[PDB]
Write a protein that holds these residues in place. Structure first.
Motif, PDB file in Angstrom:
ATOM      1  N   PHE A  90      -1.200 142.629  83.346  1.00 37.00           N
ATOM      2  CA  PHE A  90       0.035 142.747  84.112  1.00 37.00           C
ATOM      3  C   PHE A  90       1.107 141.777  83.634  1.00 37.00           C
ATOM      4  O   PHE A  90       2.283 141.962  83.963  1.00 37.00           O
ATOM      5  CB  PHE A  90      -0.240 142.526  85.599  1.00 37.00           C
ATOM      6  N   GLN A  91       0.731 140.749  82.870  1.00 39.36           N
ATOM      7  CA  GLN A  91       1.727 139.824  82.340  1.00 39.36           C
ATOM      8  C   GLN A  91       2.611 140.491  81.294  1.00 39.36           C
ATOM      9  O   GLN A  91       3.804 140.180  81.204  1.00 39.36           O
ATOM     10  CB  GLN A  91       1.037 138.593  81.750  1.00 39.36           C
ATOM     11  N   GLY A  92       2.053 141.409  80.508  1.00 31.38           N
ATOM     12  CA  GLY A  92       2.801 142.061  79.452  1.00 31.38           C
ATOM     13  C   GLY A  92       3.710 143.184  79.896  1.00 31.38           C
ATOM     14  O   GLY A  92       4.383 143.784  79.054  1.00 31.38           O
ATOM     15  N   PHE A  93       3.741 143.491  81.190  1.00 25.70           N
ATOM     16  CA  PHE A  93       4.626 144.534  81.691  1.00 25.70           C
ATOM     17  C   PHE A  93       6.069 144.046  81.692  1.00 25.70           C
ATOM     18  O   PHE A  93       6.361 142.945  82.171  1.00 25.70           O
ATOM     19  CB  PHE A  93       4.222 144.952  83.104  1.00 25.70           C
ATOM     20  N   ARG A  94       6.973 144.869  81.166  1.00 29.46           N
ATOM     21  CA  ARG A  94       8.396 144.559  81.182  1.00 29.46           C
ATOM     22  C   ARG A  94       9.178 145.815  80.831  1.00 29.46           C
ATOM     23  O   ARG A  94       8.669 146.687  80.125  1.00 29.46           O
ATOM     24  CB  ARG A  94       8.739 143.430  80.201  1.00 29.46           C
ATOM     25  N   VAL A  95      10.402 145.905  81.337  1.00 29.16           N
ATOM     26  CA  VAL A  95      11.299 147.006  81.005  1.00 29.16           C
ATOM     27  C   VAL A  95      12.251 146.534  79.912  1.00 29.16           C
ATOM     28  O   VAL A  95      13.031 145.598  80.115  1.00 29.16           O
ATOM     29  CB  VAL A  95      12.064 147.504  82.242  1.00 29.16           C
ATOM     30  N   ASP A  96      12.184 147.179  78.752  1.00 24.13           N
ATOM     31  CA  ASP A  96      12.984 146.778  77.601  1.00 24.13           C
ATOM     32  C   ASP A  96      14.334 147.481  77.643  1.00 24.13           C
ATOM     33  O   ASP A  96      14.401 148.714  77.630  1.00 24.13           O
ATOM     34  CB  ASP A  96      12.245 147.100  76.306  1.00 24.13           C
ATOM     35  N   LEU A  97      15.409 146.695  77.680  1.00 28.42           N
ATOM     36  CA  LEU A  97      16.753 147.232  77.824  1.00 28.42           C
ATOM     37  C   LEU A  97      17.472 147.171  76.487  1.00 28.42           C
ATOM     38  O   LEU A  97      17.601 146.076  75.918  1.00 28.42           O
ATOM     39  CB  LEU A  97      17.525 146.447  78.876  1.00 28.42           C
ATOM     40  N   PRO A  98      17.943 148.295  75.947  1.00 26.30           N
ATOM     41  CA  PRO A  98      18.609 148.261  74.639  1.00 26.30           C
ATOM     42  C   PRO A  98      19.874 147.417  74.676  1.00 26.30           C
ATOM     43  O   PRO A  98      20.704 147.541  75.578  1.00 26.30           O
ATOM     44  CB  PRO A  98      18.922 149.735  74.365  1.00 26.30           C
ATOM     45  N   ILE A  99      20.021 146.564  73.665  1.00 24.34           N
ATOM     46  CA  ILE A  99      21.112 145.599  73.599  1.00 24.34           C
ATOM     47  C   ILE A  99      21.571 145.514  72.150  1.00 24.34           C
ATOM     48  O   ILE A  99      20.765 145.602  71.222  1.00 24.34           O
ATOM     49  CB  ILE A  99      20.662 144.221  74.147  1.00 24.34           C
ATOM     50  N   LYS A 100      22.878 145.359  71.953  1.00 24.27           N
ATOM     51  CA  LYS A 100      23.396 145.236  70.602  1.00 24.27           C
ATOM     52  C   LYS A 100      24.543 144.241  70.587  1.00 24.27           C
ATOM     53  O   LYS A 100      25.174 143.971  71.610  1.00 24.27           O
ATOM     54  CB  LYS A 100      23.859 146.585  70.042  1.00 24.27           C
ATOM     55  N   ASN A 109      18.518 145.018  69.339  1.00 24.98           N
ATOM     56  CA  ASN A 109      17.577 144.159  70.037  1.00 24.98           C
ATOM     57  C   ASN A 109      17.406 144.647  71.467  1.00 24.98           C
ATOM     58  O   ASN A 109      18.199 145.439  71.977  1.00 24.98           O
ATOM     59  CB  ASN A 109      18.049 142.702  70.039  1.00 24.98           C
ATOM     60  N   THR A 110      16.352 144.165  72.115  1.00 29.27           N
ATOM     61  CA  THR A 110      16.046 144.542  73.484  1.00 29.27           C
ATOM     62  C   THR A 110      16.066 143.303  74.365  1.00 29.27           C
ATOM     63  O   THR A 110      15.499 142.269  74.000  1.00 29.27           O
ATOM     64  CB  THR A 110      14.682 145.226  73.579  1.00 29.27           C
ATOM     65  N   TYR A 111      16.727 143.408  75.508  1.00 31.51           N
ATOM     66  CA  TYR A 111      16.649 142.361  76.514  1.00 31.51           C
ATOM     67  C   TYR A 111      15.435 142.616  77.397  1.00 31.51           C
ATOM     68  O   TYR A 111      15.401 143.628  78.105  1.00 31.51           O
ATOM     69  CB  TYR A 111      17.915 142.329  77.355  1.00 31.51           C
ATOM     70  N   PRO A 112      14.431 141.747  77.387  1.00 33.04           N
ATOM     71  CA  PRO A 112      13.222 142.019  78.171  1.00 33.04           C
ATOM     72  C   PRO A 112      13.346 141.558  79.612  1.00 33.04           C
ATOM     73  O   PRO A 112      13.616 140.383  79.879  1.00 33.04           O
ATOM     74  CB  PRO A 112      12.132 141.237  77.423  1.00 33.04           C
TER      75      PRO A 112
END
Length: 141
Positions: A90-100, A109-112
């Motif tokens: 459960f520590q590795g769960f995250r929503v990766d948000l596209p960022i440039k 890059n992705t904002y985690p």
RNA sequence: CCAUGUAACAGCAGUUGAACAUGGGUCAGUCGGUCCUGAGAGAUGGGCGAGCGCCGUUCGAAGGGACGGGCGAUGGCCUC
């Protein structure tokens, strides 16, 4: 004794904020727990100076399912490793948000945003402190 | 075009720009095209032409489509 160490430990790797002290003592009660059994001198009712993890001569027939009311070192390790495995999953769960970059075309890059999204100390302490505050209040009263 | 950001160019300058960079934006049975032929263009037949071709556009066995009837439509097995 501790005033001198307060400022020096912060510089360097980043083991500051007193959390380095907490992990060292918290893991200690878990890691030296195994080493306690060979070094334990108190017996109570059964011999312990020679350890209890391997006591085939003392028991044997042999009752491997002993009473885990003191030194549960045999059974608690079975359950705790399950907790270690589930938490890291459960520590590795995250929503990766596209960022440039707003100027350069190319790499993205992705904002985690972590599933917890909060360090464990801010969350668990706020529930640990209130539990401690409740207990000390009842003990005093 | 829109937003954001910011040496050369905007014959001075710029904190500004139709400039530069990054990223977005145009949704239809009903508004158009698509359909018609207008001046005209242009195949086929034919003619001419060494030949690529071009003259000609009505000057050739130029219809391939019609509800209605029987063999055989039988096919759903015959309503259409």
């Amino acid at each position: 004794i501790v005033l001198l160490l307060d400022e020096l430990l912060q510089k360097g790797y980043g083991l500051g904020s007193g959390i380095s002290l907490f992990i060292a003592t918290n893991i200690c009660e878990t890691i030296v727990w195994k080493a306690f059994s060979p070094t334990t001198v108190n017996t109570g009712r059964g011999m312990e100076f020679e350890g209890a993890i391997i006591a085939l001569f003392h028991l044997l027939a042999l009752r491997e399912a002993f009473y885990r009311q003191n030194l549960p070192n045999l059974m608690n390790l079975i359950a705790t490793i399950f907790v270690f495995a589930v938490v890291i999953y459960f520590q590795g769960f995250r929503v990766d948000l596209p960022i440039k970059s707003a100027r350069y075309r190319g790499q993205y890059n992705t904002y985690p945003i972590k599933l917890f999204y909060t360090s464990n100390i801010p969350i668990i302490l706020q529930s640990a402190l209130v539990s401690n505050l409740y207990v000390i209040s009842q003990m005093l009263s």
